[PDB]
Symmetry: C2
Subunit: 91 residues, 2 copies
Amino acid sequence: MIKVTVTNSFFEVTGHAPDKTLCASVSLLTQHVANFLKAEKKAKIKKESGYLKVKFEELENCEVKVLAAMVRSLKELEQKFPSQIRVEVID
Amino acid sequence: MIKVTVTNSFFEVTGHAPDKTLCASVSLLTQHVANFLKAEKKAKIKKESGYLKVKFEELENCEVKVLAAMVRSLKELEQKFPSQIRVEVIDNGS
């Protein structure tokens, strides 16, 4: 089961899903957003085997809308694969 | 073969790839940018069976960079599955 935790300070991706396409798809999207934030000096990344944690730094209007779209995108998947991915957005 | 077209007015996605992981990665990444753009009213989405077309509207620095990043990533997948996906940026004028 893929676990995605998204807060105001960072987002975290752990675990794996039986579905290799769901698993490859989520790893691509999350790493994409992570690298986009890193590319513009807006985040520091921790990348290990089946683990990703992105720490936000100086987020502006642009990055906050990107993060929100990332949550949107993952929840649609959570709706379609409720037993393989779990999206928890904390306040 | 997945065909991605990028112009100054829109980006389009058509066809499918034999590899299911490639199809899903592309569909998710492209719909993600499309969803991002629509949320802030910067794009209109035409979504069909094996067809996606996103028409831009008043793009600012933010989306230009998000879009450039989407292309960069698709060109990267193009490198990995050369027979399964084609990314065409149509540069017209002079």
